[PDB]
Structure formats: structure tokens, C-alpha cells
């Protein structure tokens, strides 16, 4: 197979440096290059820099060659950018991407590295189930909720009975206050479904290795 | 630098229509033009490159054409796949540059969403806070309002917000509403209330429930 494959989500402090990595796996022989692209607030791309000889070299665009190193270990194909003077701004996606050469294009792209630039300290979220209201269901659908609270910093992976229950899933954006993000995820099933069989929503955050299950249970008085 | 200017930033647009999207470069780029779709959470890929050429994989529906400075991405009939961004980028020279990009949504029949709230969990109550959550789910348009009401008196502060990207499965919206208190001023009041202002009725949806009450 075929494929880029980039390092995990970063949390680093202003002021300090970050290297994060790019492996190529299954490419041509004498094909190597590397391109490097931010992307903010999941919208404008922006190049960074580039390893290619078919076009020219090693080179950076003027905006990031202060604080931007791109290197590579040529043997295993892994791509390095070391990033320096870190600001909020570089909180971002980095993805690395190869261009194939026939034309030309970006073939492959990784699947990109979240950093997050911050001082705030990673905080572990409390996870609550959310039941309907007290009282007999009115209606032949119901809907269930799980409230992630109170995290720092992203990402988090939510799921419903460990990825089996995924349709009538709606999980919605985290939303940052106060340095801390909050997270919800709606499913909804049929009335015959719930309470009689078991619904849990699963929710890992990965800068505190933390792994909860949340069951939920049909309130009580 | 070479600069890039895409329109339109969004569109709304029906299945089985036909879409042109356009990019203008600062500059003679010689066709050095890719065009890029992005789903969210994913990365971008390719559509055409060289202005007009075309690749194994992509849908016959998506062509590319232009010369000079002026450029177009055409989908001849729009499917639900389609939903997304695109982008243009210019190769010419590097700094490579993408354009700003094009929000493509799809058009649906309004509909209602569907209301439904939660009083804290007893988990949370126990550690000292109180959030109630309000699920506005698949609705259409995007407009909507969020209302909460405490003791039937509207409350602002403490309130955050987020909304979905277009389903890609019905093309509705949802949005989530979490209105958090202290469980002391929790527990200093009875009832609880949001309610939806949306295009599908003149009346508020209003859910509501009462701290003690089953
Ligand atoms: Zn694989
Ligand atoms: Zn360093
Ligand atoms: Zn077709
Ligand atoms: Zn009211
Ligand atoms: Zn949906
Ligand atoms: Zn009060």
C-alpha cells in the first residue's frame, strides 16, 4: 500500500520548539520528496516548505524560514519539520503531502499532525451520561445524550457501544472556554431499543491517556 | 507571491445541478492549476490537475478548464458526495498558493428539529455543577435561534453553542445548546426550558422540564 503517515496531536508550550514526522511507506524507488502545508480553523492552506530535487531542493517560503527546519531520513523516507518560536497562530494541522510525476500532482496526502500552542494545562474531561427527562417515554424514538466536560487540550474520539451504534449519531464540535473545550454527542434509536438494550458512549483524550464508558441509565425521583 | 481569488466563498446548490466554481491568479500561471476537494476531518485531494486534466478515480462529473489567469471547476451534475469545500492552487511557482475556498451545500426541503432537553446528571451534581443540555436535531435551513428560560425568565450567560456541518446523509443541520450553572443556583429554581425560532414555524418548539418532576 501506498501511503504517508503522520506523528499524533501535540500539545507544546509558547516560546519552545516542535518536530513532527511524515513516513512514506510503499513509494517507488527515486521518487522522494516531501511538501509541508498548514491549515488553520480547518480553512486556509498555506505552504510551508518542501524536500524535492525534481524542484530544486530544500526550500521554504519566506513567511516560515526563520522558524521552519524540514530534514529526512532518507533510508526510512520519514519527513521531519522542526518548528521554533512557537504562537498561538501555529496552532494548526500540519499535513504533509508527495507529489507523483508522470503531469504532475499531489497523489498522496498524510492525514495530518494537530499542534496546539498553549500554556493552559491539559485537563482531563469529565464525562456525563444524559437520560431523558424523568417519566414515561412519549414517543416511538428516543434520544440520548453524553456530555464531555472541561478538557484541554484537543482532540477527543467519541462513540456510541464502541463504534456499532453509528447511525442517528450526531457528535457536535468541541467549543473552547476559559482554556477548556466542551463536547456533546445526540443518538437517537427506537423507543424498543432503550432502555432494554444497552447504550454507552465511549470518549477517549488522548493528551491525559484517558479512556471512560458512560452507561446510560433511565433517571430515578 | 502569486495571488489567488475564489468565488463564490459558499454556494447553495440542488442535486442534479449544474456547478461552476472560479479562480483568478495575480498572474499568467500556465495552466499550473490543480483543483481540491476537502470533506471534514480530511485531508485534501486532488480533482484535475494542469488546469484541465483529469484522474483515475475521480468522477467523469468534475472537468477543469482556463488559461491565462482565469480558471473554472465544473460539477455537470451534483451529487450528495459532492458536499464539501474546494479548493484551487496555483504551481506556477512556489510559494504554491491555494485560493480561499468554496463552502458547496446542498439544497433540501425545510424542516423542523427536533427538541429535546436534559437536566444534569446526578454525577455532575455530586462534583458540584450543573449543565443542561438542549438537542436541536436535523433541521433546515441552517437559521436557528436558542432560547433558555429559567423559572420561565430568559437566561444568556453560561450558555455555549455548537452546530454540525450539513449532514452528509439528509442534508440537515443540528446544533447542541449547554446552558451551565452552579448546582446552587441549579437548585434555587423549578423549571427549565429551551426553545427553538426556526423558518418552519411562526411559534417556538419549547421543551421544558421541572427539577422534581417525573
Ligand atoms: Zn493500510
Ligand atoms: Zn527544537
Ligand atoms: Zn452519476
Ligand atoms: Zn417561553
Ligand atoms: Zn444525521
Ligand atoms: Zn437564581
Known amino acids: 500500500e501506498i501511503q504517508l503517515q503522520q506523528s499524533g496531536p501535540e500539545l507544546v508550550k509558547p516560546g519552545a520548539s516542535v518536530k513532527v514526522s511524515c513516513k512514506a511507506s510503499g513509494f517507488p524507488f527515486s521518487t522522494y520528496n516531501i511538501y509541508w502545508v498548514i491549515q488553520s480553523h480547518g480553512k486556509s492552506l498555506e505552504w510551508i516548505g518542501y524536500?524535492?530535487?525534481?524542484?530544486?531542493?530544500?526550500s521554504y517560503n519566506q513567511k516560515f524560514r526563520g522558524k521552519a527546519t524540514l530534514t529526512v531520513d532518507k533510508s526510512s523516507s520519514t519527513a521531519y519539520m522542526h518548528l521554533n518560536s512557537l504562537t498561538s497562530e501555529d496552532s494548526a494541522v500540519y499535513y504533509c503531502?508527495?507529489?507523483?510525476?508522470?503531469?504532475?500532482?499531489?497523489?498522496?496526502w498524510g492525514q495530518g499532525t494537530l499542534v496546539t500552542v498553549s500554556a493552559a494545562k491539559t485537563t482531563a474531561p469529565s464525562v456525563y451520561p444524559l437520560a431523558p427527562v424523568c417519566g414515561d417515554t412519549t414517543g416511538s424514538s428516543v434520544t440520548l445524550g453524553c456530555l464531555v466536560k472541561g478538557y484541554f487540550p484537543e482532540p477527543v474520539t467519541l462513540t456510541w457501544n464502541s463504534g456499532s451504534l453509528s447511525s442517528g449519531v450526531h457528535t457536535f464540535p468541541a467549543v473552547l472556554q476559559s482554556d477548556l473545550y466542551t463536547l456533546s454527542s445526540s443518538v437517537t434509536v427506537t423507543s424498543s431499543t432503550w432502555p432494554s438494550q444497552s447504550i454507552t458512549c465511549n470518549v477517549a483524550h488522548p493528551a491525559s491517556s484517558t479512556k471512560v464508558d458512560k452507561k446510560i441509565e433511565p433517571r430515578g425521583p | 507571491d502569486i495571488k489567488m481569488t475564489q468565488s463564490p466563498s459558499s454556494m447553495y446548490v440542488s442535486l442534479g445541478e449544474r456547478v461552476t466554481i472560479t479562480c483568478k491568479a495575480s498572474?499568467?500561471?500556465?495552466?499550473?492549476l490543480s483543483w481540491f476537494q476537502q470533506k471534514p476531518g480530511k485531508s485534501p485531494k486532488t480533482l484535475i490537475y494542469?488546469?484541465?486534466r483529469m484522474l483515475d478515480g475521480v468522477p467523469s462529473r468534475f472537468s477543469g478548464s482556463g488559461s491565462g489567469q482565469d480558471y473554472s471547476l465544473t460539477i455537470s451534475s451534483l451529487e450528495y458526495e459532492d458536499m464539501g469545500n474546494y479548493y484551487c492552487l496555483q504551481y506556477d511557482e512556489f510559494p504554491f498558493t491555494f485560493g480561499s475556498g468554496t463552502k458547496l451545500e446542498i439544497k433540501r426541503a425545510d424542516a423542523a428539529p427536533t427538541v429535546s432537553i436534559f437536566p444534569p446528571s446526578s454525577e455532575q451534581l455530586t462534583s458540584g455543577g450543573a449543565s443542561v443540555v438542549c438537542f436541536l436535531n436535523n433541521f433546515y435551513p441552517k437559521d436557528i435561534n436558542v432560547k433558555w428560560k429559567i423559572d420561565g425568565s430568559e437566561r444568556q450567560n453560561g450558555v455555549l453553542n455548537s452546530w454540525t456541518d450539513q449532514d452528509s446523509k439528509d442534508s440537515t443541520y443540528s446544533m447542541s445548546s449547554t446552558l451551565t450553572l452552579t448546582k446552587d443556583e441549579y437548585e434555587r429554581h423549578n423549571s427549565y426550558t429551551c426553545e427553538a425560532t426556526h423558518k418552519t414555524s411562526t411559534s417556538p418548539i419549547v421543551k421544558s422540564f421541572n427539577r422534581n418532576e417525573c
Open positions: 498572474q499568467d500561471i500556465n495552466r499550473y
Open positions: 503531502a508527495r507529489r507523483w510525476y508522470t503531469g504532475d500532482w499531489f497523489a498522496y
Open positions: 524536500i524535492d530535487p525534481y524542484n530544486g531542493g530544500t
Open positions: 494542469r488546469a484541465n
